[PDB]
Amino acid sequence: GGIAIYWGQNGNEGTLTQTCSTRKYSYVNIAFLNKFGNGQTPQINLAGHCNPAAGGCTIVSNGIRSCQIQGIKVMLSLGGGIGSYTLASQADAKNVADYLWNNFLGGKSSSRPLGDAVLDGIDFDIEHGSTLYWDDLARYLSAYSKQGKKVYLTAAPQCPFPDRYLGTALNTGLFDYVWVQFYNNPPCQYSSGNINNIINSWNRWTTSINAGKIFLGLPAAPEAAGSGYVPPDVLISRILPEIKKSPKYGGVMLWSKFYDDKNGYSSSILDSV
Numbered sequence: 001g002g003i004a005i006y007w008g009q010n011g012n013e014g015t016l017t018q019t020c021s022t023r024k025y026s027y028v029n030i031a032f033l034n035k036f037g038n039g040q041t042p043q044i045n046l047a048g049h050c051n052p053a054a055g056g057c058t059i060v061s062n063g064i065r066s067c068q069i070q071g072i073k074v075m076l077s078l079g080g081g082i083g084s085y086t087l088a089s090q091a092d093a094k095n096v097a098d099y100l101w102n103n104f105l106g107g108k109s110s111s112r113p114l115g116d117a118v119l120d121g122i123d124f125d126i127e128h129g130s131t132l133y134w135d136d137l138a139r140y141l142s143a144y145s146k147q148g149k150k151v152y153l154t155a156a157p158q159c160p161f162p163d164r165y166l167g168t169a170l171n172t173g174l175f176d177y178v179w180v181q182f183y184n185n186p187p188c189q190y191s192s193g194n195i196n197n198i199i200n201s202w203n204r205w206t207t208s209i210n211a212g213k214i215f216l217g218l219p220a221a222p223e224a225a226g227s228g229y230v231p232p233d234v235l236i237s238r239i240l241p242e243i244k245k246s247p248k249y250g251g252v253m254l255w256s257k258f259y260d261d262k263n264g265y266s267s268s269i270l271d272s273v
């Protein structure tokens with residue numbers, strides 16, 4: 001399979017263009033559109049990469065195009081660990097979908113935050129807030145595909161199944177790729193010498209939801225997460241040989257570009273994925 005990487009949350013991790021040029025990644029998720037819903041003006045946060053005011057982040061379209069030209073799919077990730085995002089009603093789900101269509105997808109807007117490039121899809125990293133309406137938001141985004149160009153839908157649920165926030169949305173069967181976060185969650189992550197919890201969880205995910213492909217999401221360095229880091233050798237010798245048996249296996253997902261560079265994680269596992 002391939003590696004999905006998240007980019008955006010550390011100004012020192014390189015440009016989107018550089019990130020794609022590594023040839024290590026097949027999917028790039030831009031993190032994050034962390035404020036939206038409830039009448040708020042949506043706002044993108046890309047840490048020190050750029051300031052979205054006055055079109056300061058439109059420069060990112062150069063990288064988006066550069067990635068796409070190389071066959072890499074680029075998604076805008078909603079949510080994250082920090083943010084006041086939520087959906088207040090089904091109407092809010094519709095307003096948000098329309099805003100996303102016009103500002104990041106095939107629609108039209110005078111103030112597209114990342115410029116004129118058209119992103120491949122939308123990634124859902126909903127970690128707190130409202131548990132309602134994410135399925136409607138997925139439906140409304142998916143309907144825009146009917147205009148001709150596919151809007152990919154991807155999701156980053158946490159490993160305990162089912163996910164309190166994304167369970168219903170994942171049940172719609174609309175998601176193309178689901179990179180489950182097998183960390184920061186004791187009952188379903190790796191712990192020294194024990195791979196049972198992670199495998200058992202992987203089995204639940206791959207047999208329970210209908211999505212195109214499911215990915216094993218991991219922290220790329222011990223600093224990238226509170227818990228659940230898996231040393232490369234253990235992944236390669238014990239985990240991959242098992243999870244690759246599933247026909248739904250798509251690859252591995254890592255948080256994040258910054259930590260991957262520091263720890264050389266994808267460099268170590270690339271050919272085994």
Ligand SMILES: CC(=O)N[C@H]1[C@H](O[C@H]2[C@@H](O)[C@@H](NC(C)=O)[C@H](O[C@H]3[C@H](O)[C@H]4N=C(N(C)C)O[C@H]4[C@@H]3CO)O[C@@H]2CO)O[C@H](CO)[C@@H](O)[C@H]1O
Pocket residue numbers: 006009032034045046047048079080081082083125156181217219223224225226254255256
């Ligand atoms: C306020 C804001 O939007 N951003 C902050 C930025 O917050 C980052 C960091 O706290 C990240 N922490 C680490 C260790 O990288 C944090 O990463 C979370 C992420 O939200 C979750 N989603 C995933 N996926 C795999 C999808 O994984 C987890 C990881 C933890 O593993 O994300 C927050 C933003 O949500 O912090 C910077 C630097 O301090 C600050 O400038 C500002 O940019």
